[PDB]
Structure formats: C-alpha cells, structure tokens
Design a protein around this ligand. Structure first.
Ligand SMILES: Cc1cc2nc3c(=O)[nH]c(=O)nc-3n(C[C@H](O)[C@H](O)[C@H](O)COP(=O)(O)OP(=O)(O)OC[C@H]3O[C@@H](n4cnc5c(N)ncnc54)[C@H](O)[C@@H]3O)c2cc1C
Ligand SMILES: Cc1cc2nc3c(=O)[nH]c(=O)nc-3n(C[C@H](O)[C@H](O)[C@H](O)COP(=O)(O)OP(=O)(O)OC[C@H]3O[C@@H](n4cnc5c(N)ncnc54)[C@H](O)[C@@H]3O)c2cc1C
Ligand SMILES: Cc1cc2nc3c(=O)[nH]c(=O)nc-3n(C[C@H](O)[C@H](O)[C@H](O)COP(=O)(O)OP(=O)(O)OC[C@H]3O[C@@H](n4cnc5c(N)ncnc54)[C@H](O)[C@@H]3O)c2cc1C
Ligand SMILES: Cc1cc2nc3c(=O)[nH]c(=O)nc-3n(C[C@H](O)[C@H](O)[C@H](O)COP(=O)(O)OP(=O)(O)OC[C@H]3O[C@@H](n4cnc5c(N)ncnc54)[C@H](O)[C@@H]3O)c2cc1C
Ligand SMILES: Nc1nc2c(c(=O)[nH]1)C[C@@H](CCc1ccc(C(=O)N[C@@H](CCC(=O)O)C(=O)O)s1)CN2
Ligand SMILES: Nc1nc2c(c(=O)[nH]1)C[C@@H](CCc1ccc(C(=O)N[C@@H](CCC(=O)O)C(=O)O)s1)CN2
Ligand SMILES: Nc1nc2c(c(=O)[nH]1)C[C@@H](CCc1ccc(C(=O)N[C@@H](CCC(=O)O)C(=O)O)s1)CN2
Ligand SMILES: Nc1nc2c(c(=O)[nH]1)C[C@@H](CCc1ccc(C(=O)N[C@@H](CCC(=O)O)C(=O)O)s1)CN2
Lengths: 287, 287, 288, 271
C-alpha cells in the first residue's frame, strides 16, 4: 500500500528531526490597541519556542517606521531574543539609511532584513546591502521569489539579481510565501545552479483567512493550486473550519519540505501564534 | 520530487471525489444538561451535511437505554434523518430483545447497529442479527476489528466470526477506530479473502483528547503508532494545539483511505461537530 | 524512493511490535554427548526470551522416545517453561496412546503436538486429536502444509483434511517450513476461506546449512525458490557467509509476516540458539 | 553483474590489527574489487603507514590501491613530490581530501595540484547529510561541484543509514550538473556504540528503528553481527533497486560482513 507506507515514513521522519529545526517568526506593527495586545501575547507564546530570531516588517509612513523600532526594542527587552527589523529603500536617502543603520547597530540591533520595499501608489535591495555592509558588519537577510518577482524582466534576471544581492554580503534568503511546494524545491535547485551559496529559507504562510491570502497572492504572483482553492471554497463564514484546513495544509507543507532537507522555516504569523505554534510543534520545535 | 508530486496528486484526487462520499455520524447519550446542549448543536451542525444515517450508542443502565430511544426519536423529529440505535445483547433476554426490536420497527426505526456489547465488570452479535431478522427485515450494521477483537481466540476466528455475523443478514460492517492505516487496508483485503461481501466502513476517531483516546485504545487493542504518540507528547495542557494536530491526522487518514477506494466513513464524533465537520469538508461533503 | 519509503515503514512498524509477539521453539532429542551440551546451552539462552512454549520432536526409536519424555521433563524442571512433547501415530496402539497421553497429563504436560508421524521405511492426526481430547482437555497443536502435504491427492483435499483435523479439537496449527511468503499468505487466506478457525502459525527455519535444508525440503515437498538457491550458490565451504545470508532471509521473512498481522512464530532451532535468538531480537522479543 | 565494489582499509596500529587486515585483504581481493583504498590519520599513522599498506596491497594482490591523501599540515611542494613519487611507482588513483583538521587548501585545490602533476584517477568525498563545517547545504553542494570540475572521476559518500538521504542527495547532484557517479559509502555495523560516536561526530543521522535494533546488545557481538548484516544487505538491496551500480565499503579492516553483503549483491569470486 504505497501511500500508506509513504505517509508512515514521512510521519516517522518528521518525529525524528525534533531538535534540528531552526525557526524564525515575522510580525508587523500593530495598528490598534487590540492588535497590540494580540501581538505581545503571540510574542510571549512563540518566544518560548526559542526561534533563531524574529523580525518586524517596515512600512512607509513615519509613525509606522518609528513603530518598527519600538517593537524591536520592546521584543529585545521582554524576551532577550535577536530581533531583526525590516529596512526598505522606500522614501529614504542613502544618508538617512546610513544614519538609521548606524543607530540600529549602536543600539544592539545587528541583524537586518534588507529590502527594496513595496512601491507606493532609485536604489535596489543589492544597493541597500552594500550600503549596510559599509556602515557595519550586519547579519543580513534578503527576499527571494520561487515564482519570480512580478517586476523582474525574467526568471533569469530575477535569479541573477538574487545572486548579485547575495554577493554584496548576505547571510540568508527568505522566500515569498508559496503553496506549490515543487516551485520552491525547483527554485532551490536553480539557486545552486546560479552559484548562490546561502540557504534559501522558505517563508511559510499559515492560511486562516483565504479571501485575504488569495488577494495578497494575486498581487504577488503566488499561485494558488486548484485543490487549495477548492479546499477553502464555501468557508467564507466558517473561521473554525478554515483554521483546521489551513493548519492541515501548512503542516503537510513543512512535513514534505523537512523530508527534502529543509531545516529552517520562517513563519508569516500575521501577529497570531496559534497556527505557527502548532506547526512548529509537529516539527519538534517545542518549549 | 517524489513526495511533492504524490502530495499534489493525493490532494487533487480528494478534491475530485466531492459528492461521491457517504458519511455517517455516531453520538452517545448525553449525561448532563451541558452535554445535551452540545449534542443538539452538533446534531444540527452535522445534519446539514446530509449523512446517510446517524447512530446512537447503547449503554447498560436502564435510564441510559431509555435515553438512547428518546434521542433517536428526537433526532428523527428534528432532522428527518435515518437514526440507528445501537442494540447490545447485554442484560437482555431474547424475549426482551424481540420486544424492543418490534417496538423500534413499529416506531419507524428500521436500521439497527447489532452488537454483543462491552462486558460489565450468553448470545453473540450473530445471534442478535438472526433474532432481529426474525422480527423484521432490518437494515443491520455490525462491528469489525482490523486489529482483532481483544477476546478473539485468533485473527482467523475473529475474521470468521465477522463472516458468520454477516451471513445472518448484515448490510455493512463498521470498524473499530484505528490509527495504523495499513492495518485497515490489509483487513479489508483479508475480508474479501474470507468471502465477506459487505463494505467494510472505517470508523474514524478525530483525536482532540489524546490521554483519553490512548486509554480507550489500550483497552481495545488499538495500536498508537510511535509517531502519533510523539505528536501529542507535551500537549496535555494545550487543547488548541491538540485539535489542530488531531485534525491534521484525521484529514491525512481520510485522504489516503479515499485514494484507496473508500467511499464511506463513520465518525466517532464524541458528540462534538467541529472536527468531523471539517474532515467531511475536505472530503467534499458540504452543505 | 518507493522501495526506500516502504523499507523505512516496515522497519519502524517492526520496531514498535516489541512486546506483542508470541514465539515458540522446537528442539530434537540429541544423539551425542556434544549435542546434549549444545541443546541445554540453547535451551538456557532461548528460555530468557519467555517463549509461549517449547516443543520436542518425537522419533520412532523406543529409547529415543524415552528421551523425548525425558527432555520435556528436564526443560520443565530446569527452566519452568511449558514444554509440549510431539506425539505421533507411529508404532502405537490407540490403547498405548491413551496411556502415555494421560501419563503426560499427570506429569504436568497439558500441551501436545499431535502428528501422524513420518512413516519409517491406520489412523491419522485427526484420529489422534479426537483420542487426546477424550482422555482430557489437552491444548493441542497440529501441522499444516502451505505447499500441500506430499501424500495429499490435492491442495483442496489436503486443505479439507486440515479442517477435519482442526474441527477435531485443536488450538493452533504450525506450518511446515517454507521460504516463499506468498504461498504462506495465500494458504492462510484459503484457510479462513475454508472455515478453519485457528491461527496458521508460520514455522520458521533459519538456514545455515543450505545443503541439508534443500535435502529436507526435497523430501517434504517444500519449494526452494530460485532466488534462494542462487543466494546460497557458491557457499558450500563458507559457513560464516551462509549464516549471515540465512539470518538475513529469516529476518526479512518475519518482518514481512509481522507487518501482515502474524503475531506468532515457531522456530525450528535445530538445537542451536544463535540464529533464532537474533531473529526474535528483531521482532522485539528480548530478555530483561 | 554490472555491480562494481571497492573496499576501504585503515593503517593497522598493532601487530594484531595488521594480521586481521591482511587476512581481510586476501579474502576480499578474491571479489575482484574495482579498487581498494587506505585511509590517512595525521596522528594515527601518518603518510608512511598509509603508503606502506598501499605498497603491500599492490605487490601482494596486484589490485589498484588508492591512498587517501590529505592536504593538512602539508605544503604544495611536498604534495607535488608525494604525488610524483606515487605516480612513478604505479599509484595512479588517489582519494583527494582536505583532511580531518587535527583554511589553507581545500580538497578542490588538491585535485588541481594533483592533475598538474599527472593524469591521476581521482575520487573525492561527498556528504549526503552535509559536511558539518559547511556554511549551508547549498554551499556544500556548490563546493562538491567545484571540486568535481577540478578533474574528478567519482565522488564517494560519507556513510549513512537513512537511504532516502542518499537518494535525495544523488538527485540534487544531478540537478546541479555533477555528472560523475556518487558512490554510496556503506558502513556494515557490528559495533553500534562506536558507529554512533562516529555518526554523532559527523552529523550522520541514526534512524530511530536502528538505535532500537541495537538496544540491549552491548554485550552480544553475535547478534550485533547478524542484525548489522541484515541492515546492510537491506540497504544495498534498495540502493541496487534504485539503480546504484557502485558500492564503497568501510570495512574497518574486517572482511566477513562486507564479503557477505557483496555476495548478496551477486559479487562473488571467479573460482
Ligand atoms: C521575507 C520578506 C519580507 C518582506 N518585508 C517587507 C517589508 O517589511 N516592507 C515592504 O515594503 N516590503 C516587504 N517585502 C516585499 C518586498 O519589498 C517587495 O517584494 C519588493 O517589490 C521587492 O523587494 P526586494 O528586496 O525583493 O527587491 P529587489 O531584490 O531589489 O528586487 C525587486 C525587483 O527589481 C529587480 N531588479 C533588481 N536589480 C535590478 C536592476 N539593477 N535593474 C532592474 N531590475 C532590477 C528584481 O529582479 C525584482 O523584480 C518582503 C518580502 C519578503 C519575501
Ligand atoms: C461501530 C461500533 C459501535 C459500538 N457500539 C457499542 C455500544 O453502543 N455499546 C456497547 O456496549 N458496545 C459498543 N461497541 C463495542 C462492542 O460491543 C465490543 O467491542 C464487544 O466486546 C463486542 O461486540 P461485537 O458485536 O463486535 O461482538 P461479537 O461479534 O459477538 O464478538 C465478540 C467476541 O466474541 C467472539 N466470538 C463470536 N462468536 C463466538 C463464538 N460462538 N464462540 C466464541 N467466541 C465467539 C469474537 O471473535 C470476538 O472476540 C461498538 C463497537 C464498534 C466497533
Ligand atoms: C511443526 C511440525 C512438527 C512435526 N514433528 C514431527 C515429529 O516430531 N515426528 C515425526 O515423526 N514427524 C513430525 N512431523 C512430520 C509429520 O508427522 C509428517 O509431515 C507426516 O507425514 C504427516 O503428519 P500430520 O500430523 O500432518 O498428518 P495428517 O494430518 O494425518 O495428514 C497426512 C496426510 O493424510 C491426509 N489426511 C489427513 N487425515 C485424513 C483422513 N482422515 N482421511 C484421508 N486423508 C487424510 C492429508 O491430506 C495428508 O496428505 C512434523 C511436522 C510439522 C510441520
Ligand atoms: C570517502 C571518504 C574518505 C575520507 N578519508 C579520510 C582520510 O583518510 N583521512 C582524513 O583525515 N579524513 C578523511 N575523510 C574525512 C574528511 O577529510 C573530512 O570530512 C574533512 O573535514 C573534509 O574533507 P573534504 O575532502 O571533504 O574537504 P573539502 O571538499 O574541502 O570540504 C570541506 C569543507 O569546506 C567547504 N568548502 C570547500 N571549498 C570551500 C571554499 N573554497 N571556501 C569555503 N568553504 C569551502 C565544504 O563545503 C566543507 O564544509 C574522508 C571522507 C570521506 C566521505
Ligand atoms: N509584496 C510583499 N510581500 C511580502 C510582504 C510585504 O510586505 N509585501 C511581507 C510578508 C507578507 C506576508 C502576508 C501574506 C498575507 C497577508 C495578509 O493577508 N495580510 C492582511 C493584512 C494583515 C494586517 O492587518 O497587517 C490582508 O492582506 O488583508 S500578509 C511576506 N511577503
Ligand atoms: N469497546 C468499545 N469500542 C467502541 C465503542 C464502545 O462503546 N466500546 C463505541 C465507539 C467508541 C469510540 C471512542 C473512542 C474514544 C472515546 C473516548 O475517549 N471517550 C471518553 C468518554 C466520552 C464520554 O463522555 O462519553 C473517555 O474515554 O474518557 S469513545 C467505537 N468503539
Ligand atoms: N516431514 C517432516 N517434516 C518436519 C519434521 C519432521 O520430523 N518430519 C519436524 C521439523 C523438521 C524441521 C527441519 C528442517 C531441516 C532440518 C535439517 O536439516 N535437519 C538435519 C538433521 C538435524 C541437524 O541439523 O542436526 C539434516 O537433515 O541433516 S530439520 C518440521 N518438519
Ligand atoms: N570525518 C571523517 N569521515 C570519514 C573518515 C575519516 O577519517 N574522517 C574515513 C572513513 C571512516 C569510516 C568509519 C566509520 C566508523 C568508524 C569507527 O567506528 N571506527 C572505530 C574503530 C573501528 C576499528 O577499526 O576497530 C573508531 O575509531 O572508533 S571508521 C569515512 N569517513
């Protein structure tokens, strides 16, 4: 019984990797008192899993950018975990960036996720990496796109950009979320073929709100397989079933990736802990 | 990428079986006002899925047995669904049984799950089937044990008993719950080899409370694979993670069984709807 | 990676079977002082595995039969395990049989392996079963032949004869040794399909001496699959390799059988403990 | 048979181990291995002991004998003299390694140096579960490719007990454009305690069923040998079914287990 054994094998393999998996969690600046509370609950919950690091997204408005720094600081004080702020090239001059970078370093924040940034309705990520490396010897993470950045002139160019980016001084790449596991695996192979020597860490998005995930997916060129669309069909008013189905999907994904050698996962928590916590548990990442 | 494709294939196959799967739900007599409320909520929730039938377990004490009948009646009135009461050979003479059977039939209850019954601290199931068939032409379901009934002198004898049982006039067999999918598949094959012509419907137990499931499993000779025990290890005080992990397991199980030709599932709901409802959804069984 | 995945699953399921396996060991009356030393050393070793029971073959020689009863007694006293003597219908009147039969029961021997017996150069096993149950409610084990008994006129006829025998009052059947798992599996299915209510316990022969195994098989109608013949080809003078190869085959066999639901094994130890001890170990059957 | 095998031996440090080794060499030589190799240990024998065994094997059996040459605590000039001497004296196959550090040169630098000296047949190490010092799995694979492109005939993998780990690695190698054979290094296990210590030290994973299989056998050598032979024969059977046509055995200087495994593979003496 093929599938029967294959499943038992996969399950047993997953149980045995307990203690070898590195995880990281991504959070975003809360916009309300309610969101803030959820965030700190999630931070405390996930901090007990001892992630290699946690990161905080960087938006464009000034208040939000001041928010990123305060939350990073708040996370460091409260948990003692390495917190990496996301830094973009949007609405910032090289001089402001060097200042922000110098201040981050002097404040004990030596890991930065260097990004170009979403374009609001000049320099590229590689330029930021170079700039940052000139300021200090930062630990740097950058974005990778298994399904190709929607702006790239070609997959070749996008893959080449990643290489250029990595060459400037990157420690790891974190992929855009995906639901087609094979796209990630193939991309990981193409990266080797492109001479990129850093680990390609999959960014995992546990889906609880499909409507919103689909919209984000449609804007980022992320493919939603037909089976997944059918799996969430008819659940617009059933949050409970969506959570169980989404967890099942996320869990199946990390199980397969783990069997393919992946030992690092980055979770897009959307500031909630439940799903990512449970996924990490199946991965053997526990308190 | 083996596992990658195999998974996508399994997932797509599951999506395409939508509308071909028959399901049934098992409930037990509530013992408190709170349990009763949960039950009716679950009944209403699951009734919208149009199960082929629902059943209600039969205990030994007199009040509980009067409970089984009232709940069956309550279910018929409220939903109009076919409700099958479980009937055991415990604390009952052939004459009482014939009376109970005659009264069930005259009351519109023509489907009975015929059982010997758990032994409290004479005749066997096959005897009850024969007795029932003499009273009326009942639609009859009986229990099957993929991992062998703990009382059987041997697997051969237990399998032979099932055949004897089926020969007396059974429409289907429902298996004891299991977590080793291969045991069920092999058993299904052995049943054919034994000349048993009824469908062997898997009884699915969605696990949310592992401690209790393990105890029941240990008493019924049901094996808990090591990977599953590890999956629930450390979750005694985390109901949320247990539910997500349990749903993942149940969902993986019905997905594999479905690919192996199973088109009938019987759920041990434990009077709760959430898990079974979500599992049925992944099976394409929706409102 | 289908072969690999299935292999992992198999090893794992076997790994957690540890504890739910029932094993029994078969011995034969030694014919030399050396053989005796070896036997009791093996009995001591294997006993620490807590076998459900152990049995001793029954020859036709009057003096050797005394050894059968004797050894059973030794085992009984020495280790305290259930020792079931083999009983044949060779050179014995229905009256003598009842004698030793109830003579055994008075000595604490409640389990007997009832056989017709090899015919040295009127009644059958079924007749002996009936004869024993009347003398007392003996726990009885009988022989089964997955590849058909040599004398049987037909597979079906042989199969019905087994039922006849079982329907006479037996608790379990033990198969002639075999090397093709399928034949055993199919036979086991045909058995339930024929209404035989007892388990068909596989008799495992761990092969170290292929030449002698092939000869015993050629006499017992047991098939030596080609792959097995090729596996031992060229090892006539290499006992070490024959042992490793044969241990491998037996471990592979009980692993497949275990995954198929078989929870009972009977080992033809040939009075040696090493191989059977190792196979049991892989089945999770280990000492304290 | 279409199946090729090679055996690995280590320099004996005692009279007893030396006798064991030569007995094994005679036994295994009859299987006509494609080649045999002899490891190196800076503080466990040095180059002279490795060279000695290689010379002995060659004169005694006439088989192709490949020394494991490391480039640690060795200068480029010394390495050149060494290679020259080996070549002029009939040693045309070398297992080029960086060496266990008791960065300088990496194995790829050694491969280049060797090819400059002569057209050696070269074998290098590959790690299905990633070399413990690698920056990442990606980098370790890239470095294998770089090493292979330097002029390698084949790669021999570190031992492993998770067969899928090897299969997945072989596929990644092919996807990476590495065209040489990735020969699985097989370790027949009789002494589990020692194997476990070496594995934990090299990041080789021990499946749960395996550790369970050796549990309670610390003082039972006979059962360990039977159980370990079973594990190895199973492994090579699966690998063989998966298209593997070459096996490299870590004999630990003992022939019984490897000889039997080869037998089950159809690799037998041509008597
Ligand atoms: C893990 C992760 C975290 C993120 N966090 C944030 C966040 O906090 N805030 C936010 O605003 N966004 C965030 N993003 C989104 C991201 O900034 C957008 O995807 C953005 O459009 C590209 O950023 P990048 O760093 O990948 O850009 P780059 O690597 O610079 O690439 C962007 C495009 O330019 C192309 N390109 C590169 N160099 C050249 C060149 N010289 N000429 C022409 N084309 C070129 C590339 O192929 C690509 O199409 C995140 C994405 C990921 C995957
Ligand atoms: C779907 C399902 C629903 C259940 N619902 C209930 C419930 O509501 N209430 C409750 O009390 N229990 C219930 N049970 C549990 C069940 O009653 C126990 O497992 C009980 O021990 C056996 O019942 P059975 O109908 O399988 O018995 P049977 O089929 O009669 O078998 C019981 C044992 O007797 C053996 N046997 C049969 N005939 C003979 C013979 N002539 N001589 C010797 N041995 C023989 C069989 O091999 C077996 O070991 C349920 C089980 C399942 C799987
Ligand atoms: C576990 C095991 C232990 C054994 N131990 C011994 C031992 O210690 N000593 C020894 O001498 N031999 C022993 N044997 C061998 C055995 O006695 C021979 O195989 C013998 O030829 C048949 O014995 P049985 O009990 O199977 O005979 P039976 O079951 O009587 O069958 C023998 C033949 O008669 C046929 N048959 C059976 N009953 C009838 C009937 N009533 N009418 C017509 N045909 C019938 C069958 O089809 C068959 O061909 C053993 C075999 C096994 C597998
Ligand atoms: C078949 C086999 C036989 C062996 N025999 C011996 C023996 O006899 N004696 C002994 O001492 N050891 C031996 N080893 C062990 C080996 O020497 C160690 O694993 C050692 O640490 C690495 O050697 P390598 O030849 O694989 O080195 P390399 O291929 O140089 O790899 C070592 C590390 O450096 C990295 N790397 C490669 N190039 C670069 C670069 N340019 N920049 C940065 N990183 C780079 C790799 O990814 C890896 O982490 C053997 C291993 C195998 C599998
Ligand atoms: N183009 C782009 N890609 C990115 C990110 C980004 O900022 N831009 C960050 C990470 C975003 C991960 C997400 C996936 C789905 C998301 C989602 O559904 N967000 C909510 C909003 C959540 C909130 O309130 O912040 C929504 O779109 O309605 S957020 C990774 N990838
Ligand atoms: N031997 C036996 N087997 C049976 C059943 C049975 O009644 N007896 C009915 C069905 C029982 C299915 C269950 C699996 C796990 C269960 C469980 O955990 N029950 C709770 C009690 C639930 C309640 O309050 O009724 C407990 O054991 O604590 S109930 C199927 N199999
Ligand atoms: N026909 C028949 N079948 C039987 C048995 C029997 O007595 N007769 C008993 C059991 C015999 C099991 C054996 C398989 C191979 C054996 C063997 O090789 N015996 C050695 C003698 C014993 C020894 O090896 O010391 C030989 O024939 O040379 S003994 C089961 N089957
Ligand atoms: N890092 C590293 N990897 C290597 C080798 C090496 O030298 N270093 C050579 C080969 C070593 C193969 C071995 C696997 C297990 C071994 C072992 O247990 N050796 C015992 C000695 C066994 C004996 O010879 O009795 C020990 O030194 O503890 S030796 C292949 N891989």
């Amino acid at each position: 019984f093929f599938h029967a054994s294959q499943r038992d094998a996969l399950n047993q393999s997953l149980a045995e990797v307990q203690g070898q998996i590195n995880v990281s969690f991504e959070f975003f600046p809360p916009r309300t008192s309610e969101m803030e509370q959820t965030l700190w609950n999630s931070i405390d919950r996930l901090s007990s899993l001892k992630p290699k690091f946690v990161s905080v997204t960087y938006g464009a408005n000034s208040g939000e950018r001041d928010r990123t720094h305060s939350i990073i600081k708040g996370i460091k004080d409260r948990t003692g975990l390495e917190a990496a702020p996301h830094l973009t090239c949007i609405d910032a001059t090289p001089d402001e960036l060097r200042t922000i970078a110098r201040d981050y370093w002097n404040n004990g924040i030596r890991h930065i996720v260097a990004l170009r940034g979403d374009l609001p309705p000049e320099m590229y990520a590689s330029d930021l990496v170079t700039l940052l490396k000139e300021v200090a010897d930062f630990d740097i993470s950058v974005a990778a796109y298994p399904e190709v950045h929607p702006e790239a002139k070609s997959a070749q160019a996008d893959l080449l950009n990643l290489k250029r980016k990595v060459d400037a001084g990157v420690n790891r790449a974190i992929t855009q979320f995906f639901f087609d596991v094979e796209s990630y695996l193939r991309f990981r192979d193409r990266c080797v073929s492109a001479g990129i020597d850093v680990e390609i860490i999959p960014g995992i998005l546990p889906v609880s709100n499909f409507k919103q995930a689909k919209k984000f997916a449609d804007m980022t060129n992320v493919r939603i397989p037909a089976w997944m669309a059918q799996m969430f069909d008819g659940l617009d008013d059933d949050a409970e079933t969506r959570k169980l189905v989404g967890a099942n999907i996320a869990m199946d994904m990390v199980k397969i990736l783990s069997r393919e050698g992946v030992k690092d996962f980055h979770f897009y928590t959307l500031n909630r802990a439940e799903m990512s916590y449970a996924i990490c548990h199946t991965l053997g990442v526990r308190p």
